[PDB]
Amino acid sequence: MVLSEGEWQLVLHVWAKVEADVAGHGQDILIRLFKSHPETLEKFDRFKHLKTEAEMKASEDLKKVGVTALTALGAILKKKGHHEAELKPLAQSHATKHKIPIKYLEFISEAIIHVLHSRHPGDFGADAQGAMNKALELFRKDIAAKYKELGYQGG
Numbered sequence: 001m002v003l004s005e006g007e008w009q010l011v012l013h014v015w016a017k018v019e020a021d022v023a024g025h026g027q028d029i030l031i032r033l034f035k036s037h038p039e040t041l042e043k044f045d046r047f048k049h050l051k052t053e054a055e056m057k058a059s060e061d062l063k064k065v066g067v068t069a070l071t072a073l074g075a076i077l078k079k080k081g082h083h084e085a086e087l088k089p090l091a092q093s094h095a096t097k098h099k100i101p102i103k104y105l106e107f108i109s110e111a112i113i114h115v116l117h118s119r120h121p122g123d124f125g126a127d128a129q130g131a132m133n134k135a136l137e138l139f140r141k142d143i144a145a146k147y148k149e150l151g152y153q154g155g
């Protein structure tokens with residue numbers, strides 16, 4: 001739903017490339033996020049002593065956090081918009097425990113697009129980038145609605 005079937009197919013085609021190395025994609029996305037938007041690192045209490053890129057890549061904790069997150073995103077993308085049951089818990093934790101504003105979900109979406117293009121340019125051209133942006137926009141719109149239902153504006 002929402003995106004066309006062709007758009008979902010582009011999203012899931014590049015996602016299959018992510019699934020060849022979920023850990024490495026997760027590390028690179030977090031490192032890109034922290035470099036581009038340094039305020040985001042303050043949300044990760046156990047990462048503040050990781051001062052260099054190589055320390056971040058060596059951290060098993062960071063790698064596991066990234067795989068957990070990308071696993072949840074991949075499960076959501078595979079629902080092709082039919083994701084209320086998957087978004088509800090994610091909104092509860094990110095609104096009420098981790099305290100993540102919707103803007104930070106924009107920042108990580110930028111980092112996702114950047115890493116996917118860096119690693120898979122032949123499988124992530126303009127049409128696929130547009131499809132993935134629409135899929136992440138839908139994710140962000142729906143999770144922002146769930147934030148409000150819980151009493152959080154996410155601003």
Ligand code: HEM
Binds near residue numbers: 044068094105
């Ligand atoms: C695509 C967007 C995201 C997805 C799919 C995602 C998914 C997840 C999942 C599945 C977890 C583990 C369970 C939980 O506590 O909810 C998690 C934990 C966490 N997320 Fe996210 N997340 C996203 C974006 C973000 C962003 C942008 C930030 C901060 C800037 C963030 C901060 C955290 C933190 C601090 C934790 C706790 C990690 C731990 O202590 O192990 N998340 N995330």
